[PDB]
Design a protein around this motif. Structure first.
Motif, PDB file in Angstrom:
ATOM      1  N   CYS A  23     -34.482  -5.130  19.129  1.00  0.00           N
ATOM      2  CA  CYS A  23     -34.925  -5.912  18.044  1.00  0.00           C
ATOM      3  C   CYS A  23     -34.719  -7.202  18.493  1.00  0.00           C
ATOM      4  O   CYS A  23     -35.431  -8.154  18.274  1.00  0.00           O
ATOM      5  CB  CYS A  23     -34.615  -5.553  16.822  1.00  0.00           C
ATOM      6  SG  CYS A  23     -34.958  -3.676  16.330  1.00  0.00           S
ATOM      7  N   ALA A  62     -37.755  -9.618  18.509  1.00  0.00           N
ATOM      8  CA  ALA A  62     -38.296 -10.634  17.621  1.00  0.00           C
ATOM      9  C   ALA A  62     -38.264 -12.291  18.255  1.00  0.00           C
ATOM     10  O   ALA A  62     -38.916 -12.948  17.713  1.00  0.00           O
ATOM     11  CB  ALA A  62     -37.134 -10.626  16.432  1.00  0.00           C
ATOM     12  N   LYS A 119     -41.741 -11.387  20.757  1.00  0.00           N
ATOM     13  CA  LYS A 119     -42.607 -10.099  20.755  1.00  0.00           C
ATOM     14  C   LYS A 119     -43.420  -9.838  22.015  1.00  0.00           C
ATOM     15  O   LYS A 119     -43.268  -8.879  22.575  1.00  0.00           O
ATOM     16  CB  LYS A 119     -43.357 -10.010  19.394  1.00  0.00           C
ATOM     17  CG  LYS A 119     -42.469  -9.964  18.110  1.00  0.00           C
ATOM     18  CD  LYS A 119     -43.184  -9.576  16.909  1.00  0.00           C
ATOM     19  CE  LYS A 119     -42.479  -9.599  15.557  1.00  0.00           C
ATOM     20  NZ  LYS A 119     -43.203  -8.871  14.640  1.00  0.00           N
ATOM     21  N   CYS A 137     -37.333  -2.191  13.499  1.00  0.00           N
ATOM     22  CA  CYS A 137     -36.671  -3.340  13.013  1.00  0.00           C
ATOM     23  C   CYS A 137     -36.403  -3.720  12.032  1.00  0.00           C
ATOM     24  O   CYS A 137     -35.784  -4.745  11.736  1.00  0.00           O
ATOM     25  CB  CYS A 137     -37.233  -4.395  14.031  1.00  0.00           C
ATOM     26  SG  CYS A 137     -37.059  -3.697  15.959  1.00  0.00           S
TER      27      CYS A 137
END
Ligand SMILES: CN(C)c1cccc2c(S(=O)(=O)N[C@@H](CCC(=O)O)C(=O)O)cccc12
Ligand SMILES: CN(C)c1cccc2c(S(=O)(=O)N[C@@H](CCC(=O)O)C(=O)O)cccc12
Ligand SMILES: CCCCCCCCCCCCCC(=O)O
Ligand SMILES: CCCCCCCCCCCCCC(=O)O
Ligand SMILES: CCCCCCCCCCCCCC(=O)O
Ligand SMILES: CCCCCCCCCCCCCC(=O)O
Ligand SMILES: CCCCCCCCCCCCCC(=O)O
Ligand SMILES: CCCCCCCCCCCCCC(=O)O
Length: 582
Positions: free
Chosen positions: A314, A318, A321, A359
């Motif tokens: 994650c 993030a 992406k 996530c």
């Protein structure tokens, strides 16, 4: 350098040059006669030599777009013939060039091009080889304004070879005919794939395209770094975009650039490129774009390392992406040259959905730890379909395998017109014989490519004549959901049988004189019509009629007074068969 024409001329060579100018002009002035174009070619070519001799001679410094634009506006009957298009000449470049693309009718109303007789073709060929091929180059180019010129030229040469080889042959027809057919299909295929891709880029947008590219490029260049692949995907996206817009020049320059680039850096991209990078300017691109997949690295880690086990999934995700997912694709794609690009997309898609949910939960690692398991049934679906189908094809022959497909889909979409069902099933079958011959490791990629055009053709000619909502859902569904959507179709229980027609099941001896391709299509049409009348018929029942029929045919085509037979047994067959099928 100081002269674009001079330059292209020196690069291309006189021959190729004159061929491309011809094609280019045929794609805009689709209505002018062949003689007219040839004159333009000569005038332009002559001009070209003027500039090769003296880079500083008149107009030699003008750009191809301007030069081309001016010559185009030179045509006197311009406004008479093309009308609105002539208004393009009032505007200055680049509006002028832009204005032209907009009036490049992607599908004019020209007569279907008829295939002459082998002898007449060979004699024409032999008598005036040059004008024979140019003349046809012209006919094809004007009917396909968006077909990339150079690829068209590439095809012309394959044709030339066929005529040179076959017209000498003992049985000219036995040599030529089959080749002409293999060239046509291959040409239809290139055309469909091109329009397909451009269509995709249109509805679905850039992202989805880049996604497709990463996967394809990775399978092909498994040894290149992800940074090299992203670089390529970027340029390839600009290339397809520009090439789809329809501008030959711009499209060509981007293509040459990317090929040049790839060759210079071929050492850090693929080993299978040496051959392709030696070839002439006009052939580099074509070659590279088809180059076989390179051998994939042996020391390659498990994906689970960086995508399931790591505690930074994650985080890394993030942070960026798409780059992350892109890396997923890159990694998964290059380890599976045996997967269809779209299957790789489904995984990536699935992976993405998971990361989005996971996530944003207590502890990620726990939520997404078993995602690769969600992949299994996804990878398997396409595989079991392939095995199950290539097996059936191994037993039955192409033909009998097509009939199986015929019965299967007619039951699925009874509303579709019989002639449409016959074509689709036949093409579907061809895919079957063309791919199943491959080692299981290449089957899936093969099916994807052939099946993609076939389904698109199916969709287009349904877009026009909407017959089923279910076919429309599949046709307008995600490009990655298309094939599964069709595989998901189930027997239509709502369908109400088609009232019996005597005319539809009566046959004449002319079915004996007809050629294979025609007898089959005549039998297959009756078959679809049979199923459309008795959908509840079991394979056994149908297999009975077909067997009965098969004989009927042979039997009546091996006896005197044919016509009598086909009408005599005809009554009998229809009668017996109707009772068997309640
Ligand atoms: C190689 N490629 C340029 C081609 C060669 C020969 C015929 C081609 C055709 S075609 O013959 O016009 N094919 C027709 C259908 C067959 C027919 O009516 O004759 C079409 O779909 O438009 C289409 C696309 C590419 C072709
Ligand atoms: C030569 N270079 C500029 C290229 C042009 C067009 C397609 C290219 C590709 S590709 O699109 O992945 N290769 C295509 C076939 C070529 C085509 O349809 O244009 C594919 O496998 O679907 C890879 C590398 C270089 C390419
Ligand atoms: C692609 C450019 C080369 C032109 C040479 C084509 C010669 C074959 C003539 C028949 C084409 C009609 C299409 C077909 O039915 O095969
Ligand atoms: C270089 C980064 C660009 C690649 C972006 C990764 C996209 C993966 C998602 C797959 C979705 C396919 C698109 C679709 O839904 O049709
Ligand atoms: C004014 C007429 C301009 C002539 C058209 C020249 C464009 C053809 C260049 C071909 C370059 C090959 C590009 C490629 O590899 O795809
Ligand atoms: C007819 C030949 C059998 C084809 C089986 C369908 C498999 C399609 C693979 C493409 C995909 O990934 O959806
Ligand atoms: C209209 C006929 C439907 C076309 C279906 C083609 C899909 C091929 C995949 C094979 C299958 O799953 O049935
Ligand atoms: C109710 C009337 C049914 C009789 C018509 C039978 C015709 C069906 C088509 C048979 C084709 C079988 C294929 C083949 O053997 O080549």
């Amino acid at each position: 350098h100081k002269s674009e024409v001079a330059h292209r001329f020196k690069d291309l060579g006189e021959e190729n040059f004159k061929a491309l100018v011809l094609i280019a002009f045929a794609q805009y002035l689709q209505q002018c006669p062949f003689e007219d174009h040839v004159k333009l070619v000569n005038e332009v070519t002559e001009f070209a030599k003027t500039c090769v001799a003296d880079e500083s001679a008149e107009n030699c410094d003008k750009s191809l777009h301007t030069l081309f634009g001016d010559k185009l506006c030179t045509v006197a009957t311009l406004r008479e013939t093309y009308g609105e298009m002539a208004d393009c000449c009032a505007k200055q470049e680049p509006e002028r060039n832009e204005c032209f693309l907009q009036h490049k009718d992607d599908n004019p109303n020209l007569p279907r091009l008829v295939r002459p007789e082998v002898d007449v073709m060979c004699t024409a060929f032999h008598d005036n080889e040059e004008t024979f091929l140019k003349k046809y180059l012209y006919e094809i180019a004007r009917r396909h304004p968006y077909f990339y010129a150079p690829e068209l030229l590439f095809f012309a040469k394959r044709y030339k070879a066929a005529f040179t080889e076959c017209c000498q042959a003992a049985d000219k027809a036995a040599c030529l005919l089959p080749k002409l057919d293999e060239l046509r299909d291959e040409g239809k295929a290139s055309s469909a794939k091109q329009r397909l891709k451009c269509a995709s880029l249109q509805k679905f947008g850039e992202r989805a395209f880049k996604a497709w590219a990463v996967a394809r490029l990775s399978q092909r260049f498994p040894k290149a770094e992800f940074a090299e692949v992203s670089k390529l995907v970027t340029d390839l996206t600009k290339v397809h975009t520009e090439c789809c817009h329809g501008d030959l020049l711009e499209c060509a320059d981007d293509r040459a650039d990317l090929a040049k680039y790839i060759c210079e850096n071929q050492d850090s991209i693929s080993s299978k490129l040496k051959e392709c990078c030696e070839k002439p300017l006009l052939e580099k691109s074509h070659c590279i774009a088809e180059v076989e997949n390179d051998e994939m690295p042996a020391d390659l880690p498990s994906l689970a390392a960086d995508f399931v086990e790591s505690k930074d999934v994650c985080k890394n995700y993030a942070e960026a992406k798409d780059v992350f997912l892109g890396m997923f694709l890159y990694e998964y794609a290059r380890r599976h040259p045996d997967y269809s690009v779209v299957l790789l997309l489904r995984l990536a898609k699935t992976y993405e959905t998971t990361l989005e949910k996971c996530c944003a939960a207590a502890d990620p690692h726990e939520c997404y730890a078993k995602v690769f398991d969600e992949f299994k049934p996804l990878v398997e679906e396409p595989q079991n379909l392939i095995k199950q189908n290539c097996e059936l094809f191994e037993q039955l022959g192409e033909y009998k395998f097509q009939n199986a497909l015929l019965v299967r889909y007619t039951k699925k979409v009874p509303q579709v017109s019989t002639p449409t069902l016959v074509e689709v099933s036949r093409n579907l079958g061809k895919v079957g014989s063309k791919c199943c011959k491959h080692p299981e490791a290449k089957r899936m990629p093969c099916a994807e490519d052939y099946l993609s055009v076939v389904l698109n053709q199916l969709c287009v000619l349904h877009e026009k004549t909407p017959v089923s909502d279910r076919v429309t859902k599949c046709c307008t569904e995600s490009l990655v959901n298309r094939r599964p959507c069709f595989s998901a179709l189930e027997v239509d229980e709502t369908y109400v049988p088609k009232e019996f027609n005597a005319e539809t099941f009566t046959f004449h001896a002319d079915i004996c004189t007809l050629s294979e391709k025609e007898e089959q299509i005549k039998k297959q049409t009756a078959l679809v019509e049979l199923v459309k009348h008795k959908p509840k018929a079991t394979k056994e029942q149908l297999k009975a009629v077909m067997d009965d029929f098969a004989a009927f045919v042979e039997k009546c085509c091996k006896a005197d007074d044919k016509e009598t037979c086909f009408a005599e047994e005809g009554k009998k067959l229809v009668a017996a068969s109707q009772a068997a099928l309640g």
